[PDB]
């Protein structure tokens, strides 16, 4: 039997597209398959994301996989609440509680608050970015209002590609005159290498400075550039290579050809592509448990237009979203426990420092326990 | 979206309307590609945007000129999410430049569930650290 | 090759001093250790 799903992928997001088909070969058990139906679009213009969304509604899809930027987040979460066609995705979690949307990516905002308590800071400057979002900034302003440590939260996402090197330097010249020796970066990977290369030239990576790269891919950025210098670079990582299943995947991921899967011949896997790999398990676990209870999925024969005076929902989608939520399976990330909101709980974030021979774990964060000291 | 496409079917020359923080991008994406012009009294979009004309002027310039005129350096700030986050981004850049110890605390997530208990606790955490200069900044109902 | 292994091990802050001592001082790339704060003297005969 063939389940039609929908794939919204960014232009140039090849490794996220490559980790999709790896889940398609391996995780599609022989009892049932699911038709992939990938569409290509630019994530920024919400004209385009509107276009392929109704196009998947015109073809008819039971669950949609995609990526949303901050620019087009409220096109998706508003549509899926009004057409009941649920949405599973690795992007950053929305503000508050939006329904019908399954966030594969874990929330992070407690752990960064947890880690500053661990190292006992007071002066952490927090360099953020716009297109990742602002919700993490809002959590560490009021909590820094509550426990009273200064936050010199400076935007850096405004910078154009013509005049990068001047403004990054005039940034860190201002943290020098304020005597700021603790910096937190919070960006997508493509910006984090750009900041840390402007660090390595202006020379802020000696003993005495401390960093927290604070996205989920901590080893995914290159850390041979600031390795040997003496900057204690902590991080956060969910895709832990010490596990058997991940070490089994790296062996599988290395055995795939370069022209067939771009970014296959690597020893490390990006956190977006890793959650893309775990999402295809969670999607397939849903339609498996959908057929075992034999809940029949009635589809309109020719769906038509999404632009209708009020567009009628179809209540088999209500069956789908409960099947998407009621899944507890293991993955690369850990114990996938979804609430009714679409978030994750009972997940481990591995606090991982940087000693000179390479990245080393020093504990784990969850919602239950904040800082655990894994070995007078 | 539905009001936009239905009016684009009716043969309109320009579109006059409002937009909140939620659907700020849907109009600026559509009117950019479809080349219909949009004049609006809503809040101004951060950065440039094609084919959209904001009637309401900017504000962040005057709020940075006013604080310099009162010689402040220690002031709280009670923003609202749904007007935008644009003004909060502006003063925190100026927080680095002139030693403003801004204590910016959200207020918009607080809703009709817990009204009087939470707001007094908000003023307590300003008073216990002795904040005197509270630039609250929001729509008129949250002002009231 | 030496000065790139300097820039990774971080010996180019205020407090270190260098003398590249061949005759081509601007001929080597000096945008790598420029902004850091290492007072890099040199020697040059081909004066522009």
From Swiss-Prot, chain A:
Detected in forebrain. Detected in dendrites of neuronal cells. Expressed in the pyramidal cell layers of CA1 and CA3 and in the granule cell layer of the dentate gyrus. The lineage of its organism: Eukaryota, Metazoa, Chordata, Craniata, Vertebrata. Residues 1-376 are extracellular. Ionotropic glutamate receptor that functions as a ligand-gated cation channel, gated by L-glutamate and glutamatergic agonists such as alpha-amino-3-hydroxy-5-methyl-4-isoxazolepropionic acid (AMPA), quisqualic acid, and kainic acid. L-glutamate acts as an excitatory neurotransmitter at many synapses in the central nervous system and plays an important role in fast excitatory synaptic transmission. It is found in: Cell membrane; Postsynaptic cell membrane; Postsynaptic density membrane. The gene is Gria2. Induction: Down-regulated in the pyramidal cell layer of CA1 in the hippocampus by global ischemia. Homotetramer or heterotetramer of pore-forming glutamate receptor subunits. Tetramers may be formed by the dimerization of dimers. May interact with MPP4. Forms a ternary complex with GRIP1 and CSPG4. Interacts with ATAD1 in an ATP-dependent manner. ATAD1-catalyzed ATP hydrolysis disrupts binding to ATAD1 and to GRIP1 and leads to AMPAR complex disassembly. Interacts with GRIP2. Interacts with GRIP1. Interacts with NSF via its C-terminus. Interacts with CACNG2, PICK1 and GRIP2. Interacts with GRIA1 and SYNDIG1. Part of a complex containing GRIA2, NSF and NAPA and/or NAPB. Palmitoylated. Depalmitoylated upon L-glutamate stimulation. Ubiquitinated by RNF167, leading to its degradation. Glycans are attached at residues 232, 346. It comes from Rattus norvegicus. The postsynaptic actions of L-glutamate are mediated by a variety of receptors that are named according to their selective agonists. This receptor binds AMPA (quisqualate) > L-glutamate > kainate. This is Glutamate receptor 2. Disulfide bonds join 54-306. The M4 transmembrane segment mediates tetramerization and is required for cell surface expression. The chain holds residues 25 to 415 of 883 of the full protein. Belongs to the glutamate-gated ion channel (TC 1.A.10.1) family. GRIA2 subfamily.
